[PDB]
Write a protein that binds this DNA or RNA. Sequence first.
DNA 1: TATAATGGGAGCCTCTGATGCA
DNA 2: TGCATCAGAGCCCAAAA
Lengths: 85, 226
Amino acid sequence: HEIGQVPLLTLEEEVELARKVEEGMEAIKKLSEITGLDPDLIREVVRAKILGSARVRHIPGLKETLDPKTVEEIDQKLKSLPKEH
Amino acid sequence: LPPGVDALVKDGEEVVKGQELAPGVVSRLDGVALYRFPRRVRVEYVKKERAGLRLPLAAWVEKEAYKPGEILAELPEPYLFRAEEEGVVELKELEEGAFLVLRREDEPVATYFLPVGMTPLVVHGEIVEKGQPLAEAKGLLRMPRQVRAAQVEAEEEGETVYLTLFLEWTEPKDYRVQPHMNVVVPEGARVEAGDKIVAAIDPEEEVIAEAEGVVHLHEPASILVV
DNA sequence: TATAATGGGAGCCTCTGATGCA
DNA sequence: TGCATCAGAGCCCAAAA
């Protein structure tokens, strides 16, 4: 029943989401370059803010323990970027 | 949205609950309507040129500029507007009204403007000689709805006026967007030559803006009311 | 690592106490 | 508030296998 509440994608919708997903990963790589920050660490911070405060946990690969303090700190470095960055 | 049916509301428009979005589609809630994947992008290109006209002096109303729809002249009797150059005719017809362009050795020698009430007596690519009638003007002739006149200069020779008009108008061009293409430009955007409008998988399938114009989105797959 | 694929599948007794109903 | 309905609780020993 829960599965049936998410409508199936149109070919357009399917291509759009896939397209946005690919573009987002390329952006995370780019954001890594600019900042000199771990691409995985950046990805978890980006992902943390989308999923919300609900899910926040330590990630086995991240070198630093991932908690609201660090994602705020790192998010603030991201919010310090120039418009084009 | 049923295939082919175009939306009533525009992208970004505040919408009340119950308002009709499409011929068969009615919105269930208030909020901002957003177009879901536009199938056809229409670009209105901005053109600013110089075109001439000659009218009986008694038939013409003196103005420094003419807004769309405004009466340019009223002719007591039918008038034959005649060519002032020899050339081959390039006929460019707008929504209403027409443009006529005389060219000889390539280089355009004349640009004439035929408002509404003036029926071209020539066809595209027709050879004309100085003095042969291009268009008939009967009754009241006025500016077309889609074309303006920013400046009007007038010289008087004999019983006629020759208007040198600085005209501004928009020419629509439609572009088709395929499921694998995404529109990278917002509704109402201002584009210069070279700016990309629609993007696609490969470079030869992209839509790049040819010149200055404004962008309008039509026939969306669905409308998302948020 | 790439045609497209998009919602499952089944079954054989009595007392006591809490729960859901005019 | 007093009655019905259902879920859950039990149902011999030892021997044997």
